[PDB]
């Protein structure tokens, strides 16, 4: 494979070699794994070649026959490899799911899949539960029935690993997904019928907590005002307004809903009446009364919003305040080996974080007696974060397996993520952590140093900075950096640390975690790493990244304020490390991590392809663009170039040290740094 490569002559020879290897040793995991991987790659190569040739009747039938001939051995080998490995079968399981969803509609392939499912153990599918649930509504009924049967089996054993995603799918806007989710849930109820109801009520009440009616009205009025005044989209304005009134038609259910109705609902109904009069007549004087009422109630709720510092359960949702000693386990805490930690009680008070999105701070009490804090995110998808967390788990496992990485104690800090809806969801709250921006601000306030000193110097030297050309921006940025001492982070690390013995360990952990996360983010194409988006632990010192909204070079692609920085390595972090700079722990740790990942490129590639080819996450790609298949293929090819090292120069393959050196030079380059948005804090 290394020398000849992949082509028509190579495949039979490599296949016969691996088949002989399997024959001489049945029990060897590596032989079966390599055999299955080779067959899968052969299938992909044949599909790509036929796509390139025929598209650009009989040939289609011949291709189908060849693919069917190569598919079944791949499936059987993957199942056997899963059985043998027993613990590190995530890559093989995901390959199984890919083959199942791509070619399972064929009766022979489906028979192979059902035979493997019968042969394989149930516990393995806990890793790929989300990938299974991503394809609940597959148009092919043959695959769908097997998926539903497998999910019924999963509900039978370890039901806790399936309740949350089933509950999320049940409330889906599309009819087929929610229908199949309810069809699985009715079968699951005959087992317990209690876990399902508890999950349903918890999900509904948590969704109610995450987004309140007044907040929904606030955002809807913002969107409607924008549409009407900028785009003159009256029809779109009405379309945005109507679901809020439809939700009003349900009527109040809690004390907060009753108070909100008594306050605003009469004005809202009057404005809706005016809108209906406008719809039946078409008069500006009819719509202006509704607009005046909307703006009045909008001003009232805007004034009210800052006063909403904290939320109590008794007003927002007494249903949760009623909950006691539920069998329902803490979200993101169930483990097939560990004892189930079911929820004991919910704290009556939720401290809403005063942010743009206003996330709540929910804290649960477990059956074991340990608090579990969570953040209630509103109007933002978490499935992307779920896949990111799964990838981080795989990376942690790979780093644990490696001897050198384990020796250096390299790991990615990860927090439990539990989606609840397309807009709302649950995030595990990591303790003893705070954003880099907060630490910088606190240190500068303590030292009486102006918080925005660098930007102020830039504006003083050049008031037209944003409109300067590239070289002028470079000159201004260099002048600002030179006239500022960028040792704030290291100084505050030394001051915060109790003793130098703890200080050095914290600095070492910070350096190693930062290097690991930088390399992983570059491979993942994670962007928008502004100082508020990454948090520093105050005890271990490990760097933690959150808000994985932008992925796969989205920041580079977007035309407004594009980012040329693969990963944040600004001079503040550089000074925070050893006095020597990046050449010490950081660069060597990056070498080790890149070597480990390039060694295991297959597993990370499979995990990435799983949720890149996922239809539920292709909307981000379409928003990035300006079809779907070419975009996903290009993204996967870019990831492949990153892993192999052919990203910088397609013709020339790059070794790990040179690739890391180029990454560091690019990330630390002043020319690439000054293109960043000011809020990204390049000077920091």
């Amino acid at each position: 494979l290394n020398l000849q490569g992949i082509n028509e002559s190579t495949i039979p020879k490599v296949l016969q070699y691996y088949s002989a290897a399997t024959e001489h040793d049945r029990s060897w995991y590596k032989a079966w794994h390599a055999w299955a991987v080779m067959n899968f790659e052969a299938v992909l190569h044949y599909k790509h070649q036929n796509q390139a040739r025929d598209e650009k009747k009989k040939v289609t039938e011949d291709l189908s026959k060849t693919l069917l001939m190569y598919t079944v051995p791949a499936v059987q080998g993957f199942f056997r490899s899963i059985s043998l490995s027993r613990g590190n079968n995530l890559q093989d399981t995901l390959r199984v799911l890919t083959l199942w969803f791509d070619y399972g509609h064929w009766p022979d392939v489906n028979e192979a899949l059902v035979e493997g499912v019968k042969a394989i153990q149930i516990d393995t599918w806990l890793q790929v539960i989300p990938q299974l649930i991503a394809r609940i509504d597959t148009p092919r009924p043959l695959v769908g029935r097997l998926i539903h049967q497998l999910l019924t089996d999963i509900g039978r054993y370890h039901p806790q690993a399936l309740i949350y995603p089933l509950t999320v799918a049940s409330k889906s806007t599309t009819t087929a997904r929610h229908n199949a989710a309810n069809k699985i849930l009715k079968n699951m109820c005959e087992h317990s019928n209690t876990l399902v109801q508890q999950a349903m009520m918890v999900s509904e009440e948590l969704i109610r907590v995450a987004i309140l009616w007044h907040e929904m009205w606030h955002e809807g009025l913002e969107e409607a005002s924008r549409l009407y005044f900028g785009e003159r989209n009256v029809k779109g304005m009405f379309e945005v307004l109507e679901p809020l009134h439809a939700m009003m038609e349900r009527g109040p259910q809690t004390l907060k809903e009753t108070s909100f109705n008594q306050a605003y609902g009469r004005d809202l109904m009057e404005a809706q009446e005016w809108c209906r009069k406008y719809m039946k007549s078409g008069n500006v004087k009819d719509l202006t009364q509704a607009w005046d009422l909307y703006y009045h109630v909008f001003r009232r709720i805007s004034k009210q919003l800052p006063q909403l510092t904290s939320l109590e359960l008794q007003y927002v949702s007494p249903k949760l305040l009623m909950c006691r000693d539920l069998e329902l386990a803490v979200p993101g805490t169930y483990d097939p080996n560990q004892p189930i930690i079911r929820i004991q009680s919910i704290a009556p008070s939720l401290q809403v974080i005063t942010s743009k999105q206003r996330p709540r701070k929910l804290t649960l009490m477990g059956s074991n007696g340990h608090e579990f804090v969570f953040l209630l995110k509103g109007h933002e998808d978490l499935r992307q974060d779920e896949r990111v967390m799964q990838l981080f788990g795989l990376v942690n496992t790979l780093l644990a397996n490696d001897p050198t990485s384990l020796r250096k104690n390299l790991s990615i800090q990860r927090y439990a993520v539990i989606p609840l809806s397309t807009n709302s969801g649950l995030i595990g709250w990591v303790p003893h952590c705070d954003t880099l921006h907060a630490l910088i601000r606190d240190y500068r306030e303590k030292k009486k140093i102006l918080l925005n000193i660098e930007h102020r110097i830039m504006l003083r030297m050049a008031p037209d900075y944003d409109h300067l050309t590239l070289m002028q921006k470079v000159e201004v940025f260099e002048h600002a950096v030179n006239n500022t001492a960028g040792d704030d982070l290291a100084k505050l690390l030394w001051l915060k640390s109790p003793s130098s013995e703890v200080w050095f360990d914290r600095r070492t952990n910070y350096t190693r975690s930062l290097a690991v996360m930088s390399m992983v983010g570059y491979i993942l194409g994670l962007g928008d790493r502004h100082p508020s988006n990454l948090m520093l632990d105050r005890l271990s010192g490990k760097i933690l990244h959150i808000d994985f909204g932008d992925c796969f070079e989205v920041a580079m692609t977007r035309e407004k304020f594009p980012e040329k920085i693969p990963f944040r390595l600004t001079r503040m972090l550089t000074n925070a490390m050893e006095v020597t700079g990046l050449d010490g722990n950081y660069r060597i740790t990056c070498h080790t991590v890149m070597e480990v990942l390039r060694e295991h490129k297959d597993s990370v590639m499979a995990v990435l392809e799983a949720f890149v080819y996922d239809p539920l996450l292709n909307w981000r790609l379409m928003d990035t663009n300006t079809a779907l298949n070419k975009k996903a293929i290009q993204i996967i090819n870019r990831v492949r170039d990153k892993l192999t090292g052919r990203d910088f120069s397609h013709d020339d393959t790059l070794d790990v040290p040179t690739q890391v050196e180029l990454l560091i030079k690019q990330a630390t380059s002043h020319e690439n740094l000054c293109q960043c948005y000011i809020g990204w804090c390049p000077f920091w």
Partner: protein, 59 residues
């Protein structure tokens, strides 16, 4: 006994230090509080440290 200890250590083999690893506030008070508040804090901490255990039976 020193010879026996060294001999048994050698017989057991030089364990890899990582294998050994896997086999197994007052300054913060200064950093947080000002001096006027720090002095009672550290004083109370030390007095509590003495307060526990049998050294109390003497002090």
């Amino acid at each position: 006994t020193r010879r026996e200890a060294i001999r048994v250590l050698g017989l057991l083999g030089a364990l890899d230090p990582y294998k050994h690893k896997v086999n197994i506030e007052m300054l913060v008070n200064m950093g947080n509080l000002p001096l006027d508040e720090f002095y009672p804090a550290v004083s109370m901490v030390a007095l509590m440290r003495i307060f526990r255990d049998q050294s109390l039976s003497h002090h």
